[PDB]
Design a protein around this ligand. Structure first.
Ligand SMILES: [Mg+2]
Ligand SMILES: [Mg+2]
Ligand SMILES: [Mg+2]
Ligand SMILES: [Mg+2]
Ligand SMILES: [Mg+2]
Ligand SMILES: [Mg+2]
Length: 306
RNA sequence: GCCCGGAUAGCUCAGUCGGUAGAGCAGGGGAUUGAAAAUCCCCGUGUCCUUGGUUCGAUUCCGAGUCCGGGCAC
């Protein structure tokens, strides 16, 4: 029953600023919960905290992967669980910060044990999709596992491939393995969510930030990655907002003005989904990004002195 | 100045053999178990620029005006 804090929130919601200000009055250690901040070399498009901020408040799980190696909600959970153990072992409190809700969830509720990704069976699935379409595969999942086929839409290639993969590797069906649940988070958690008061102030912040990034050398950063020659668009790192568009721009597929437009829209569509996650998230305390930055007080009380 | 194209959804455009119109993008909502900043589901009424003419009926055809792209000319 150790204590832990979750500081969730969409992009451009001032999450980071709040976490370090909290580090000031609470014995907390920061753990980054972000599928893109894990990459080395991806610093400005990911809104990664700068060296000075990191100097003040060290973050765990930052720069732990090369953009060529994918991460997962499961690896995060493992690494997070371990990091939390270390932190609480030192008499302090884990403060998990980020906007990757699926990770927060996997950590909180756990994940039913399933086989990890197998490049080989996925290549075979991709090949059969190019030949017969994702339809033949959905019709095949329908035979072996129809609970899943009713949930997964025939147009969702990621989930479809995933449900077949699990079966082709284990022989056991996806709905069957998921009957066994994962280990819940053995902590007492205080969950907070912070966002600007209006959807449109969020949009303004997203737009002005994108421009600050371009002004800070974002293009140069993405080019260094483009020049490596070993990265591609089926990699999570290259599909990150901003990066995917800039990649299209470097490839000569779109113009500069067009890249800026799509990056901003992509960032807004991302924010919109993060809010969809937070809506209905159980036990969440809402805070406000706009000036109520002095929201550390609501935190202060919900968590009470520690 | 003259000629030729455009002008229809917040943007880029289709379309209507004349019976008041629909895609994509933007935007909104919702899913979400090892790629998740991903992947996917659902939501389309707008003076069809204006004005005359023909017509039961015009955004649609024809004239004219206005604005926007080009071209010709100075
Ligand atoms: Mg047209
Ligand atoms: Mg007709
Ligand atoms: Mg309509
Ligand atoms: Mg949309
Ligand atoms: Mg008329
Ligand atoms: Mg007319």
């Amino acid at each position: 029953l150790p204590k832990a804090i979750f500081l969730m929130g969409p992009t451009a919601s001032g999450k980071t600023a709040l976490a370090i200000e909290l580090r000031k009055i609470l014995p907390v250690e920061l753990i980054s919960v972000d599928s893109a901040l894990i990459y080395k070399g991806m610093d400005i498009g990911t809104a990664k905290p700068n060296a000075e901020e990191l100097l003040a408040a060290p973050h765990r799980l930052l720069d732990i992967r090369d953009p060529s190696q994918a991460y997962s909600a499961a690896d995060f959970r493992r690494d997070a669980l371990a990091e939390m153990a270390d932190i609480t072992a030192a008499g302090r409190i884990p403060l998990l910060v980020g906007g990757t809700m699926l990770y927060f969830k996997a950590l909180l509720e756990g994940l039913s044990p399933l086989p990890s990704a197998d490049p080989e069976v996925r290549a075979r699935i991709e090949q059969q999709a190019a030949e017969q379409g994702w339809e033949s595969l959905h019709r095949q999942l329908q035979e072996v596992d129809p609970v899943a086929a009713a949930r997964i839409h025939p147009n969702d290639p990621q989930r479809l491939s995933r449900a077949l993969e699990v079966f082709f590797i284990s022989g056991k069906t996806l709905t069957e393995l998921t009957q066994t649940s994962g280990d819940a988070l053995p902590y007492q958690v205080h969950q907070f969510a912070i966002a600007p008061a209006s959807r449109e102030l969020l949009h303004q912040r997203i737009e002005q930030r994108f421009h600050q990034m371009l002004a800070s050398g974002f293009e140069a950063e993405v080019r260094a990655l483009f020049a490596r020659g070993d990265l591609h668009t089926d990699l999570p790192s290259i599909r990150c907002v901003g990066y995917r568009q800039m990649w299209s721009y470097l490839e000569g597929e779109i113009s500069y003005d067009e890249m800026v437009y799509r990056g901003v829209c992509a960032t807004r569509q991302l924010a919109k989904r993060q809010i969809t996650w937070l809506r209905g998230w159980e036990g969440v305390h809402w805070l406000d990004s706009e000036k109520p930055e002095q929201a550390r007080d609501e935190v202060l009380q919900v968590v009470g002195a520690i």
